[PDB]
């Protein structure tokens, strides 16, 4: 919609489009249109500084990014003070912005210090768990972190995101996440069995399908999953792979119960 | 404290004056108060220049908010009513410096001064100065009263005087700028009414103000080159009147000429022809007259800026004058006009020779640099001539040599004999100015720095620079020579004879050369660790002694600063010594001078950065200490540095969410700072810390943590007696009781 109607539009409404257009462009990954949409936003607004900082980080202009982050903080002081005066509940929205700005600061020191990566990942994992369990905040935070980390490099965060989506009536989004975690679309290739790499993803996918109408298919798939797990456990037993074994056994139990509960 | 300060401020009363003011500011920074106020009274009543200096300098240096205003307001009010001019300039500067304090009295003070200035409008000029100073220093409360301002200035302006006009037009300019940022018809009406010599040079400046504010583009050229609806509607009438006045009054009447020269280019920039040939005639006629020769070229250049495609016809005339004026060496503006002309390449070639025949003069090299900037083409001939003239100057008066050394580093150039000539130069030199500039030029000209040719020359020259930088009897060029060595020099500073000299440089007296040398050596030691490492270990041992075994408040602070620098640079030497150092620093914090605490807190943050996941187990105590300091302003350390160090700890070590549970008041504290202070840095640091700790779920926050009631069904007769008793008993508990 944004692409279709750009020259057919007035400047006043162009300004209001710019933010959503830039957000969509960032989400898709087309960096050409993101700059065009960003340059239209006023420079005095918090969002303008935020998006200019994002672009600067993408283009490795760290000093400019720091300047933009500082300016964004100065622009945020007013809203935070206004809302903080009454109750902590009303101030949460700005607290999320403060969280995002600090995470953006920490994004630098990830492109410069290779010896400081695992600690940053652990810190991110521990901090994300103290926030509220809304979906949009998680979406924003994960989008911010996605500048240097791909989903395949940290599975548990995305698995928890998919599980959170599941308990809400948004099963399609969880389907998309699990599809982009498996690497293929088992929905298209019905005649084929599920892939066996990353068993946790397969387990989560089977219970999402059970959440939908495909109950008997889920049961049939789970039986084969258990058979394959037992065969793999027997054929790949080694003293080195004991922790693995311990994590394998703990998985099989969780499978078995489900079977019975479904039977 | 009493007599010494009195003597110092008397010497101030009786270049040198500015140095004395700076020295007084430094002495106050080191710091009696009653004697200082008595001294201010002593010098005020009597001389006035030093009193103004003393009064003005201390403002913005000490922490006086209200009593200082209450005392100095009378001093400033006594002088303005009746007094001689000129000296007022400094009193006005003092007023401006005072007015930027802003402690709950600016509105009253400024309105009082403005009203008393309007009353007068040695009396009128004082009011003009007061209005101008209040407009500059206080845009807010000056904007409060505008109609009386305009009405009374329109009366006082048109008196037969020049001094009162020169300030009235400036006050009008300030008021109109403030009005535009957030009257014009009245201004134009009263300006045109008078014209129908006294009622010329003020009306012209007022119309200039209106025209300039109408289009800021022309003034954005005027200002830049100097350093090197309403009017539009009534455009035809004003243009016709101005043209008639110019054509008719050819020799009717200095001041009018400068006003005309000021107006012509801005008017042309408003609309680039109608009277171009006429403007050419006026300006050129004004040139040959010495009293107007300086301003005539200003007008010519400004009009060349305004009018673009019609000035070229008169290139031969102006140039004919220029080549005649310089051979003897007014042209200071000629060069600005020539530079503005390009904003045209073959005439500059011929113009090259006499500009360089001028010798060394200010604004020439900058003019050439800007010319090369806008039009990239002819430069090699410029460089050749410049180098030849510089050589002729340096083979053989003092300020000329200084300017030559300054010029020898500007823009590109195309040098073996020159370096050795400079070696002779700074050697024949008992002068803080010649030597400093020569050393700067030598440092800049050796920018290139793997081939073993010119390496020997670099070695010899660098040896000489180090010798001078370490042996200078005075301190001010040692600091410049040392600082001139940046990160680029690593190959030659890794030698032995140079490292020994650098070591000698350490343990100096000024403490600034000490910081610079320790920073430099710390930057080194990644290339020649054989020599630097033991020396730094020894210096670390010495630093930990001074701080531990000396009961003095100055050396401890200096040593803490030197430890902070050492930790920041060369961090591979500190990792095995983390536990001892920390244990020492904490001891200084656990004691029943603010600088010592500030430096200790500052260095703890750098210690935190250099480590992490190894400073855990030490976070709880440092968290208790800094929290105790954050509240409880009895131990009033700074807050910016404390918040900075807290954030550094949390970020580096990794400590999230748990602090909220362990210290339930950490959130109620951090938000309060947002509604109580007026510092950008403090607020930004608080926001950064809130971000680093992470957003917390409101439910988790919850987990972590009568008169109307009297009105029931009681009759009114019984209600009145009670509430009265409740209120009285509420008062009846100490405090206010003091007088009640």
From Swiss-Prot, chain A:
<comment type="similarity">
    <text>Belongs to the PI3/PI4-kinase family.</text>
</comment>
<comment type="subunit">
    <text>Part of the mechanistic target of rapamycin complex 1 (mTORC1) which contains MTOR, MLST8 and RPTOR. The mTORC1 complex is a 1 Md obligate dimer of two stoichiometric heterotetramers with overall dimensions of 290 A x 210 A x 135 A. It has a rhomboid shape and a central cavity, the dimeric interfaces are formed by interlocking interactions between the two MTOR and the two RPTOR subunits.</text>
</comment>
<feature type="repeat" description="TPR 9">
    <location>
        <begin position="120"/>
        <end position="154"/>
    </location>
</feature>
<feature type="repeat" description="TPR 10">
    <location>
        <begin position="155"/>
        <end position="198"/>
    </location>
</feature>
<feature type="repeat" description="TPR 7">
    <location>
        <begin position="47"/>
        <end position="79"/>
    </location>
</feature>
<feature type="repeat" description="TPR 8">
    <location>
        <begin position="80"/>
        <end position="119"/>
    </location>
</feature>
<feature type="repeat" description="TPR 6">
    <location>
        <begin position="13"/>
        <end position="46"/>
    </location>
</feature>
<feature type="binding site">
    <location>
        <position position="254"/>
    </location>
    <ligand>
        <name>1D-myo-inositol hexakisphosphate</name>
    </ligand>
</feature>
<feature type="repeat" description="TPR 11">
    <location>
        <begin position="199"/>
        <end position="236"/>
    </location>
</feature>
<protein>
    <recommendedName>
        <fullName>Serine/threonine-protein kinase mTOR</fullName>
    </recommendedName>
</protein>
<comment type="function">
    <text>Serine/threonine protein kinase which is a central regulator of cellular metabolism, growth and survival in response to hormones, growth factors, nutrients, energy and stress signals. MTOR directly or indirectly regulates the phosphorylation of at least 800 proteins. Functions as part of 2 structurally and functionally distinct signaling complexes mTORC1 and mTORC2 (mTOR complex 1 and 2).</text>
</comment>
<feature type="binding site">
    <location>
        <position position="207"/>
    </location>
    <ligand>
        <name>1D-myo-inositol hexakisphosphate</name>
    </ligand>
</feature>
<feature type="binding site">
    <location>
        <position position="167"/>
    </location>
    <ligand>
        <name>1D-myo-inositol hexakisphosphate</name>
    </ligand>
</feature>
Swiss-Prot record, chain B:
<feature type="repeat" description="HEAT 1">
    <location>
        <begin position="1"/>
        <end position="31"/>
    </location>
</feature>
<feature type="repeat" description="HEAT 16">
    <location>
        <begin position="450"/>
        <end position="489"/>
    </location>
</feature>
<comment type="subunit">
    <text>Part of the mechanistic target of rapamycin complex 1 (mTORC1) which contains MTOR, MLST8 and RPTOR. The mTORC1 complex is a 1 Md obligate dimer of two stoichiometric heterotetramers with overall dimensions of 290 A x 210 A x 135 A. It has a rhomboid shape and a central cavity, the dimeric interfaces are formed by interlocking interactions between the two MTOR and the two RPTOR subunits.</text>
</comment>
<comment type="similarity">
    <text>Belongs to the PI3/PI4-kinase family.</text>
</comment>
<feature type="repeat" description="HEAT 12">
    <location>
        <begin position="344"/>
        <end position="376"/>
    </location>
</feature>
<feature type="repeat" description="HEAT 19">
    <location>
        <begin position="575"/>
        <end position="613"/>
    </location>
</feature>
<feature type="region of interest" description="Interaction with NBN">
    <location>
        <begin position="1"/>
        <end position="457"/>
    </location>
</feature>
<feature type="repeat" description="HEAT 11">
    <location>
        <begin position="309"/>
        <end position="343"/>
    </location>
</feature>
<feature type="repeat" description="HEAT 10">
    <location>
        <begin position="273"/>
        <end position="308"/>
    </location>
</feature>
<feature type="repeat" description="HEAT 17">
    <location>
        <begin position="492"/>
        <end position="530"/>
    </location>
</feature>
<protein>
    <recommendedName>
        <fullName>Serine/threonine-protein kinase mTOR</fullName>
    </recommendedName>
</protein>
<comment type="function">
    <text>Serine/threonine protein kinase which is a central regulator of cellular metabolism, growth and survival in response to hormones, growth factors, nutrients, energy and stress signals. MTOR directly or indirectly regulates the phosphorylation of at least 800 proteins. Functions as part of 2 structurally and functionally distinct signaling complexes mTORC1 and mTORC2 (mTOR complex 1 and 2).</text>
</comment>
<feature type="repeat" description="HEAT 6">
    <location>
        <begin position="181"/>
        <end position="215"/>
    </location>
</feature>
<feature type="repeat" description="HEAT 2">
    <location>
        <begin position="32"/>
        <end position="64"/>
    </location>
</feature>
<feature type="repeat" description="HEAT 21">
    <location>
        <begin position="659"/>
        <end position="695"/>
    </location>
</feature>
<feature type="repeat" description="HEAT 3">
    <location>
        <begin position="65"/>
        <end position="102"/>
    </location>
</feature>
<feature type="repeat" description="HEAT 4">
    <location>
        <begin position="103"/>
        <end position="138"/>
    </location>
</feature>
<feature type="repeat" description="HEAT 18">
    <location>
        <begin position="533"/>
        <end position="572"/>
    </location>
</feature>
<feature type="repeat" description="HEAT 5">
    <location>
        <begin position="139"/>
        <end position="179"/>
    </location>
</feature>
<feature type="repeat" description="HEAT 20">
    <location>
        <begin position="616"/>
        <end position="655"/>
    </location>
</feature>
<feature type="repeat" description="HEAT 15">
    <location>
        <begin position="415"/>
        <end position="449"/>
    </location>
</feature>
<feature type="repeat" description="HEAT 9">
    <location>
        <begin position="238"/>
        <end position="272"/>
    </location>
</feature>
